[PDB]
Design a protein around this ligand. Structure first.
Ligand SMILES: [Mg+2]
Ligand SMILES: [Mg+2]
Ligand SMILES: [Mg+2]
Ligand SMILES: [Mg+2]
Ligand SMILES: [Mg+2]
Ligand SMILES: [Mg+2]
Ligand SMILES: [Mg+2]
Ligand SMILES: [Mg+2]
Lengths: 159, 104, 44, 130, 99
RNA sequence: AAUUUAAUAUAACUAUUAAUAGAAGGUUACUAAUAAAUUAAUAAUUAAUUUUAAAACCUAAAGGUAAACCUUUAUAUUAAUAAUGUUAUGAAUAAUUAUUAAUAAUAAUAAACUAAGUGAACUGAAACAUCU
């Protein structure tokens, strides 16, 4: 059987397991450790759920590429360079930081709800929010509408 | 009127034609999976239309199909499982012997 | 006479629980139905 | 001659290094009578049938959900030039899980309406409040 | 040359983009030996996020009624069947236990 | 500005004396990770006092087994914004719902010391049975 009979697409989804369609990356092709750093918890604290989700899957795809390269390295040539391994470890660090952030975000939301279940704190919070900006001495006129829209969207389910 | 195998075949055809999954998606959603799969070099017994992976031991055939489709867009038409054995080894004769990992 | 084989019986002291204390690891399946005998069941 | 490089009896076995060893190691899929089935925690999907088959319960099958519009810009790593951001929570004993902190954040959201944080606007900021 | 060197405090070095100690000659506190100048930096790899995109904020706390994280995504964030966390007691439980 | 003696380590046990106190292992893998707060100290490191996040499977007793397996729908459900494909001629849908309230869970459970039940025989008596 001859391979001349095949039209292999250059955009075949199996190329996503390689970087720049390279069988195995060289030290020059790998990202130098000096210029690279894993994500920080505070930087992931203010990334939307979509952003964290997409970053998770990008991390997983890169880890898959590194995994195949590392398997070829440690199974066939049996070298002890351990570069792909630490690079994937950095990615894994970012991943568990993301997991931590998501958990803490949900727990903080739940704690806020439980705090505002209490009638006393709810009354205090609404009274302060009404006295501070709402019912001002006629200084703000138009932006009060934006404040009210945000209020009805946040404290209640009004869209 | 139509055999269930024929019905499955039309299901897969309809999935491909409409661009959706060529299979039935499950209800146990997993937003953040940390499973990793390893592409492997072809063997003499495979054809250019086949690809083999090293996958988690607790992984599943449907799991591989869904993972490939949603994460990479690769549609696996037929998946087949090969679970390997673990041979005994000992780094030295003066150590407890233990079986090597079983790779899937 | 005195009751040696009854007096020398000991039973583990279950802790007192307030309405907001931590749950015990395992829970009885059914509600308790009699008071507690100071000496418990004989074991001999 | 099993191995052409050993013409005389010296103690080497037909195969392997030792004929004996520990037998109290855990079992696996390849060992046991035909009746033995250990499994790999890979199928709790459906119900066996009274005859021998197996019916898949699709509400228990795992589906890997991915963003509808994926952002192909958050790379796995971050530019080393940006210093690691740090956070300071002064006035809150509960830290990031503090309802008072969340209420302050909601207050400022109400007043300002999705305003960028100092650490976000400045790539050269080492730490920020909240 | 310097015989010995001491460290009496810490400070954030912006050139190193990190916290470093005050390297000072053992003896006079004022005389401080500066840290070496880092080699100039320049990145080209595509696996590193740009600074602006990396630090751009896209999440704000804007609701107390709707969860920012979907219900079906929680199991991937925390184990629901965890043996390392337990609840408290109620009047029903304490009545069940006390004789 | 060196060089040797005598003590001292996160890195041994044993005996005594004096204080203080009554604290996980295994298997292999979708590896089992954290985050902050406080006052007094020339954006801050004293440490030490409070808070926290995660943590797969097995170690008799949610059920079963041939330990790390399997089987039980805590992604399991009344209520809701609309419905595809149909509802024995304005609502009720086997792939389901941004959702909201209610309802079953997790035995890691040491040793030594103490109290109690039943309790030998070897042996000694230069034999042996009372006795020991
Ligand atoms: Mg098979
Ligand atoms: Mg033999
Ligand atoms: Mg056999
Ligand atoms: Mg059990
Ligand atoms: Mg059986
Ligand atoms: Mg006794
Ligand atoms: Mg005698
Ligand atoms: Mg005799």
């Amino acid at each position: 059987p001859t391979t001349s009979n095949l039209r292999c697409p250059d955009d075949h989804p199996l190329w996503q397991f390689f970087s720049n369609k390279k069988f195995i990356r060289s030290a020059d092709d790998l990202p130098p450790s000096s210029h690279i750093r894993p994500w920080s918890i505070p930087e992931l604290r203010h990334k939307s759920f979509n952003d964290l989700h997409s970053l998770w899957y990008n991390c997983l795809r890169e880890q898959n590429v590194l995994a195949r390269e590392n398997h070829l390295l440690k199974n066939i040539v049996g070298s002890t360079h351990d570069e792909f391994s630490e690079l994937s470890n950095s990615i894994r660090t970012t991943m568990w930081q993301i997991r931590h952030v998501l958990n803490e975000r949900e727990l903080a939301y739940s704690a806020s709800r439980e705090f505002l279940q209490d009638e006393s704190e709810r009354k205090k919070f609404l009274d302060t929010l009404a006295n501070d900006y709402f019912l001002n001495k006629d200084i703000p006129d138009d932006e009060v509408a934006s404040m009210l829209t945000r209020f009805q969207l946040a404290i209640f389910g009004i869209s | 009127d139509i055999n269930v195998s024929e019905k499955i075949y039309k299901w897969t055809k309809a999935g491909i034609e409409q661009g959706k999954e060529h299979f039935k998606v499950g209800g146990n959603k997993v937003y953040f999976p940390k499973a990793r799969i390893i592409l492997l070099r072809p063997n003499a017994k495979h054809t250019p239309y086949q690809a083999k992976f090293i996958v988690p031991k607790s992984f599943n055939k449907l799991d591989l199909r869904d993972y490939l489709y949603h994460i990479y867009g690769l549609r696996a038409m037929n998946i087949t499982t090969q679970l390997l054995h673990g041979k005994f080894n000992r780094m030295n004769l003066q150590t407890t012997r233990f079986r090597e990992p079983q790779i899937k | 006479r005195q009751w040696r084989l009854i007096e020398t019986r000991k039973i583990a002291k279950q802790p007192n629980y307030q309405v907001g204390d931590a749950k015990p690891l395992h829970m009885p399946k059914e509600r308790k139905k009699f008071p507690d005998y100071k000496y418990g069941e004989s074991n001999i | 001659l099993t191995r052409p490089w050993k013409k005389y009896r010296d103690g080497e076995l037909f195969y392997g290094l030792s004929k004996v060893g520990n037998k109290r190691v855990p079992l696996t899929t390849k060992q046991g009578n035909k009746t033995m089935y250990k499994g790999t925690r890979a199928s709790g999907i459906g119900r066996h049938t009274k005859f021998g088959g197996y019916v898949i319960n699709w509400k228990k099958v795992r589906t890997y959900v991915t963003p509808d519009m994926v952002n192909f810009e958050l790379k796995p790593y971050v530019n080393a030039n940006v210093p690691p951001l740090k956070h300071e929570f002064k006035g809150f004993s509960g830290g990031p899980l503090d309802p008072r902190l969340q209420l302050l954040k909601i207050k400022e959201y109400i007043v300002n309406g999705r305003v960028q944080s100092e650490g976000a606007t400045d790539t050269s900021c080492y730490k920020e409040r909240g | 040359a310097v015989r010995d060197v001491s460290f009496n405090g810490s400070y954030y070095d912006a050139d190193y983009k990190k916290v470093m100690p005050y390297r000072c000659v053992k003896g006079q506190p004022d005389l401080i030996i500066p840290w070496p100048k880092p080699d100039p930096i320049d990145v080209q790899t595509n696996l590193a996020t740009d600074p602006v995109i990396a630090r751009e904020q896209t999440f704000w706390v804007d609701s107390v009624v709707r969860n920012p994280i979907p219900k079906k995504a929680i199991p991937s964030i925390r184990n629901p069947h965890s043996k390392y966390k337990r609840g408290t007691l109620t009047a029903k439980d304490i009545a069940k236990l006390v004789a």
